[PDB]
């Protein structure tokens, strides 16, 4: 039952990821002063301008231009030869700030907006994530690590990766194609770039046993990649949602994460759905689990909760849905309380995926033991 | 930023202009070979625009959202569990009369009557008045509604937006092509 | 009766002059295709963006971004180290284009808008212009000439000049102060810059007999000037009207020139007022002449015509006003007909003054002989 599956990822220098980081950098700055703020930030990045817009309900004061320039400068855009300069780019702010207002049960607050959220978890990997998306993130993350520490000074922030895994009876048996498009300077020649990228990025990351002679490598297939970033293509917040969550391995609700405060179910419930999906798999209840949570605006309780185990469940499916409702409080404020999301920790989550990194509140498997005991699996 | 087109090899051997993933889906669940929940979700909002424009309900306004929760059983739909229809109106109409009109003129003509039982829950403007909406209510960007465009949550998505892209970009044409081959296989 | 008079000028790299050149570059591009177009272009220049806006009534197609980038590139902003890059700057267009419509007397068209226009001319200089403004323009024009031809490669586009002339009984007897602020690169040291600027710019331009020991030179009085242009300060179209026309020597109506088609009396009538003022002085009727023309929107004939000779007239003042009405057709379309303004020649006029350069249609003294004969001065 061999079949090829492909997943891709982009580096922090990609225009669609610059907007995500800028939006979350604004969110983190606000959460430091007013944790209970309401933030919905949308960022548009063009060849020489950054447009930051959205609606904010807070009592905090932030300098949008300073935050934006620092975020871009940390990425590594410092002069116009790269195609974008942090110190000499227009930063327009369309943010509409309001004033917070001032006795019922806080956990009974209805959802601020309707939407669909999907959570996924599989025992395929150690971090309970799909394998193809994890290694796609490793390549671009390795590219940024190598560029910044000075191993390859001629690299530039923009980079994209794409790995095609060859499954067989549900198990990975090799890698069929690796694509690594990276932005460089005009100093380096094309032939030497491919040798350096292959030896210094692809080799240290991917397991050697998967890379056989049949594996095809496409390192900058077109040619020179000198001018990139915002000049090469426009960037908008939430255009890279699939590469953030799971790649193509799991269904997605369609709600962007970056630039949204935890009070919006479009972000917190997706984290919560991943939280309950990871715990179910970590508890041994199922090899793969997919959770769908749906909210109606102005209504506290979710309109629907769906658990799907793809016929890999150790307990009857209707029993799992009872366990999810019993243990996890899925009301919009209950998600914040059970995950402690009111902290400025969202700058780091907008770079190489919101899931799979264990230092996040929603990546903790603490209720796994409780679920296993409740299901009576000993 | 407008540029100028340039000016002998095989045209079919042109490489892809950019990398990406494209997913195509098709199921014999519906007549048009599409997931059922997304089709009826589109019907409600499409009916809302049709009613507003032809003058049946002059107090409606363009912004509207719908959400239908279907109850499956052994892979077959047996009913509808929840219907949500948030619509923008004018300040002229009162809240109570809006719910009666929307329920009778939008939800009733669209959804099959046998699915709407007494256990079905209707949420028509659950918050309250919805007068000022559209761009003022929230920002809008191209490609932020990709999931509602293709299939809803029933199928996986590659993550490439469609609107504003010419057919030469595989982020749009290949998604259409993937749907084309998926529909033919099921058909 | 000694008194010091000061006039200043700015180079083509100044942010307020970049907007003027960009606006007129758009105007010239439109006039090449549709000479009878209606153009009112306003340009806003910021640290990393150029906003081109206005209302156009034409059937012509122009690429605003291409025109803007070419205009800035010709000025000499090519990389971000100068503070502004033509190839990597945002060019937003807010231009609202309409469609021209499709039998009365063309010369009876009323003025499209009301306004005041002032024309001035004095026999103080050869080109019939105030002396202080002419030499102020020479210094900045010399700075651009030296920078471009490669005599001083370390110069940069932004530059400002200011010359203080010492009059005595209405005649210039010397120069009391010269100020020349110029943008340079970090390569050149401050001490060597002053020696080079003084020897290569101030010396070749100003007459040697005026520069005495009492003359004070201020060459970059603050210090280093490396980052300038749009980053240093914002630029808007029509913020440098006084340095365009005459400096402080003559009154001004307050209407900007750049970005306006000839059909608007805010520009053509100012050219026409200068035209009649130059001819009156060139005919020997007066040593100094000042003309004010006022239009009411929707009315053809000017609401008021004023001639002022400051008591230097060789003929009675009330006779001069009759001569102006007799010879010069001051109706809004009559100005275009008697000056041939429907040509793309306005890119050159937005750099170092609209007046005093003899290759312009309004700088021709052709009716001077006719006026002298009519006044009966032989």
Q: What is the largest CA-CA distance in chain A?
A: 68
Dihedral sign of CA atoms C238, C243, C248, C253 in order: negative
CB contact under 8 A, B157 and A222: no
Eight-class DSSP state of A17: H
- This structure's resolution (Å) is 2.8
Neighbouring residues of C18: CB distance < 8 A, sequence distance ≥ 6: C12, C43, C45, C71, C72, C75, C229, C230, C235
Report the distance separating Cα C208 and Cα C186, nearest Å.
Answer: 31
Report the distance separating Cα A95 and Cα A63, nearest Å.
Answer: 11
Q: Under the phi-then-psi rule, with left for phi > 0, alpha for psi from -120 to 50, and beta for the rest, what region is A57?
A: beta
Q: What is the DSSP string of C344-365?
A: S--SGGGSS-SSS-TTSGGG--
CB pairs under 8 A between A and C: 48
- Residue identified by tokens 């041939």 is C340
A78: nearest CA partner in chain C: C80
C80 contacts in chain A (CB < 8 Å): 79-80, 85, 87-88
Residue C337 marked ligand-binding: no
B3 contacts in chain C (CB < 8 Å): none
Q: C-alpha C192: how far from its chain's center?
A: 32
C68 contacts in chain B (CB < 8 Å): none
Neighbouring residues of C119: CB distance < 8 A, sequence distance ≥ 6: C270, C272, C273, C274, C275, C276, C277, C278, C289, C290, C291, C292, C293
Task: Please note each residue after which chain A is broken, C-to-N distance over 2.5 A, or write none.
Answer: 102
The residue among A69, A73, A90, A91 with the most chain C CBs within 10 A of its CB, best to mutate, is A90
CB contact under 8 A, C81 and A84: no
Neighbouring residues of A105: CB distance < 8 A, sequence distance ≥ 6: none
Neighbouring residues of C237: CB distance < 8 A, sequence distance ≥ 6: C19, C20, C22, C23, C41, C42, C43, C44, C256, C258, C259
Report the distance separating Cα B35 and Cα B25, nearest Å.
Answer: 9
Angle at which helices A265-282 and A332-339 cross, to 10°: 60
Please tell me whether residue A155 adopts helix, strand or coil conformation. Answer: strand
φ, ψ (nearest 5 deg) of residue A94:
-110, 20
Report the distance separating Cα C10 and Cα B184, nearest Å.
Answer: 70
Report the distance separating Cα A229 and Cα A242, nearest Å.
Answer: 20
Residues in chain A: 378
- Residue C157 · residue C144 · CB < 8 Å: yes
Q: Does residue B14 sit at the A interface (CB-CB below 8 Å)?
A: no
φ, ψ (nearest 5 deg) of residue C223:
165, -130
The residue among A50, A88, A89, A186 with the most chain C CBs within 10 A of its CB, best to mutate, is A88
Q: Does residue A372 sit at the B interface (CB-CB below 8 Å)?
A: no
Give residue C76's domain range.
Answer: 15-107
Q: What is the DSSP string of A80-121?
A: GGGT--STT-EEEEEEEEE-------GGGPPBSS-EEEEEEE
Report the distance separating Cα A68 and Cα A138, nearest Å.
Answer: 26
Closest Cβ opposite residue A242 in set B81, B153, B159: B159
Q: Does residue C94 sit at the A interface (CB-CB below 8 Å)?
A: no
Eight-class DSSP state of A59: S
Eight-class DSSP state of B136: G
A228: nearest CA partner in chain C: C88
A53: enclosing H helix or E strand: strand A49-57
Task: Please note each residue after which chain B is broken, C-to-N distance over 2.5 A, or write none.
Answer: 7
CB contact under 8 A, B153 and A179: no
Strands (E), B35-183: 60-73, 76-89, 121-124
Q: Could you count the other beta carbons within 10 Å of the beta carbon of residue C172?
A: 17
C368: enclosing H helix or E strand: helix C368-374
B24: nearest CA partner in chain A: A248
Closest residue by Cα to residue C328 from C338, C317, C314, C343 = C338
SS3 content of chain C, % helix, strand, coil (to 5): 35, 25, 40
B2 contacts in chain C (CB < 8 Å): 63, 65-66
Closest residue by Cα to residue B105 from B38, B46, B56 = B56
Q: CATH no. for residue A89?
A: 3.30.300.10
Please indicate the experimental technique that yielded this structure.
cryo-EM
Report the distance separating Cα C345 and Cα C25, nearest Å.
Answer: 10
Q: What is the largest CA-CA distance in chain B?
A: 68
Report the distance separating Cα A250 and Cα B167, nearest Å.
Answer: 27
Burial of C198 (0-12, 13-18, 19+ CB in 10 A): middle
Report the distance separating Cα A350 and Cα A24, nearest Å.
Answer: 7
């Amino acid at each position: 039952a061999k079949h090829l599956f492909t997943s891709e990822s982009v580096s922090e220098g990609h225009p669609d990821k610059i907007a995500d980081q800028i939006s979350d950098a604004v969110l983190d700055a606000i959460l430091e002063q007013d944790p209970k703020a309401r933030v919905a930030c949308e960022t548009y990045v063009k060849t020489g301008m950054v447009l930051v817009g959205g609606e904010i309900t807070t009592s905090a004061w932030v300098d949008i231009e300073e935050i934006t320039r620092n975020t871009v400068r940390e990425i590594g855009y410092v002069h116009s030869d790269m195609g974008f300069d942090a110190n000499s780019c227009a930063v327009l702010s369309a943010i509409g700030k309001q004033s917070p207002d001032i006795r019922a049960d806080p956990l009974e607050q209805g959802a601020g907006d309707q939407g669909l959220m999907f959570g996924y978890a599989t025992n395929e990997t150690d971090v309970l994530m799909p394998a193809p998306i994890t290694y796609a993130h490793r390549l671009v993350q390795r590219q940024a690590e190598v560029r910044k520490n000075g191993t390859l000074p001629w690299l530039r922030p923009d980079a994209k990766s794409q790995v095609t895994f060859q499954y067989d009876d549900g198990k990975i048996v090799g890698i069929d194609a690796v694509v690594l498009s990276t932005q460089h300077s005009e100093e380096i020649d094309q032939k030497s770039l491919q040798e350096a990228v292959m030896e210094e990025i692809i080799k240290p990351i991917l397991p050697a046993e998967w890379l056989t002679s049949a594996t095809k490598f496409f390192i900058n297939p077109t040619g020179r990649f000198v001018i990139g970033g915002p000049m090469g293509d426009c960037g908008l917040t939430g255009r890279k949602i699939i590469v953030d969550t799971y790649g193509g391995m799991a269904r997605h609700g369609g709600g962007a994460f970056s630039g949204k405060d935890p009070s919006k179910v479009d972000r917190s419930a997706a984290y919560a759905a991943r939280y309950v999906a990871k715990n179910i798999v970590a508890a041994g209840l199922a090899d793969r689990c997919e959770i769908q949570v749906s909210y109606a605006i102005g209504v506290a309780e979710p309109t629907s909760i769906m658990v799907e185990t793809f016929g890999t469940e150790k307990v009857p499916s209707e029993q799992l849905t009872l366990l999810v409702r019993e243990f996890f409080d899925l009301r919009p404020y209950g998600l914040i309380q059970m995950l402690d999301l009111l902290h400025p920790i969202y700058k780091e989550t907008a770079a190489y995926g919101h899931f799979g990194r264990e230092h996040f509140p929603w990546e903790k498997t603490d209720k796994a033991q409780l679920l296993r005991d409740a299901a009576g699996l000993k």
